[PDB]
Amino acid sequence: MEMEKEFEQIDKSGSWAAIYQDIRHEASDFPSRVAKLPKNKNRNRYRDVSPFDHSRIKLHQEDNDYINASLIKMEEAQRSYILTQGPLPNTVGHFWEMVWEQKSRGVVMLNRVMEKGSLKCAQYWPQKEEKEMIFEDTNLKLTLISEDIKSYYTVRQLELENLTTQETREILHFHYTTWPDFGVPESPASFLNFLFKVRESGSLSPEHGPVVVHCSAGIGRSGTFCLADTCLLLMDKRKDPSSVDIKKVLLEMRKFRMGLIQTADQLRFSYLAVIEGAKFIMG
Numbered sequence: 001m002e003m004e005k006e007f008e009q010i011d012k013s014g015s016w017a018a019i020y021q022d023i024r025h026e027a028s029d030f031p032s033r034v035a036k037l038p039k040n041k042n043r044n045r046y047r048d049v050s051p052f053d054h055s056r057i058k059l060h061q062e063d064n065d066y067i068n069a070s071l072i073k074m075e076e077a078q079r080s081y082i083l084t085q086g087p088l089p090n091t092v093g094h095f096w097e098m099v100w101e102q103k104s105r106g107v108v109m110l111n112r113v114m115e116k117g118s119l120k121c122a123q124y125w126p127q128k129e130e131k132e133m134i135f136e137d138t139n140l141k142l143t144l145i146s147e148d149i150k151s152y153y154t155v156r157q158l159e160l161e162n163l164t165t166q167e168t169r170e171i172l173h174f175h176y177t178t179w180p181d182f183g184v185p186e187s188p189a190s191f192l193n194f195l196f197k198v199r200e201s202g203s204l205s206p207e208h209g210p211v212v213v214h215c216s217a218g219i220g221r222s223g224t225f226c227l228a229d230t231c232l233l234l235m236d237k238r239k240d241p242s243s244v245d246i247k248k249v250l251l252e253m254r255k256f257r258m259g260l261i262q263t264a265d266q267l268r269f270s271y272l273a274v275i276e277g278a279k280f281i282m283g
């Protein structure tokens with residue numbers, strides 16, 4: 001079925017939970033043996049969220065190459081994404097090592113450091129120009145260059161230096177700051193505006209390594225971001241945009257990381273975003 005009318009049909013019939021459970025039943029199951037080794041327990045935020053072995057990002061280290069991060073490679077859309085958990089106190093150096101080694105331009109953050117009164121990720125970037133951060137375990141230096149605070153999101157320019165080679169690179173930090181503590185946004189308008197700002201920066205383009213996207217577990221909000229982006233790109237590429245099937249795209253992405261889209265409300269929100277976005281792209 002088309003999307004917008006499939007949407008109204010699920011709303012009128014109140015069957016979002018049943019649709020979402022079908023997706024959960026049909027989703028791929030691949031091994032995640034490296035994630036579950038005992039030496040990696042303090043590298044995982046949640047015991048039930050792990051990268052598959054076949055698609056995990058490897059650190060270029062011979063001691064321990066493990067990080068909770070997955071490469072999502074979308075062949076028809078010609079887009080790649082790295083989805084990862086919010087960094088832990090003992091993995092902030094690993095996180096920036098990955099950004100460096102994978103040649104990423106942009107980092108997309110979809111959570112606040114504190115939500116619901118608890119910490120959802122480490123403070124992993126510097127908050128003042130004159131107070132830079134050094135990660136001694138991976139030999140990197142990170143400096144805040146500029147910060148632009150808007151009503152729904154903040155964009156930061158950061159300088160990452162490999163202290164071993166003295167090479168430097170500019171990283172863009174796109175921070176969506178207004179996702180509610182409970183539920184999903186009422187309107188997708190500010191989320192779509194944010195997605196378009198990431199796009200306009202070049203961070204998603206083939207001349208760079210894959211964008212790094214995270215929330216707390218790296219599957220819910222993060223899944224919503226890459227699902228909406230890929231579906232909108234496919235609608236631009238195909239002769240028949242109504243052929244794009246968001247449930248099929250989601251199941252393809254779940255071949256590369258488990259659990260993408262965590263609730264039926266996040267599934268409905270993804271439909272809403274793609275539907276509204278497809279009208280702005282044109283006419």
Ligand SMILES: Oc1ccc(CNCc2cccs2)cc1
Pocket residue numbers: 041042043044045046047088090
């Ligand atoms: O330092 C840390 C201590 C524990 C945790 C959480 N570990 C979750 C688990 C993963 C696998 C089995 S249990 C994170 C960091």
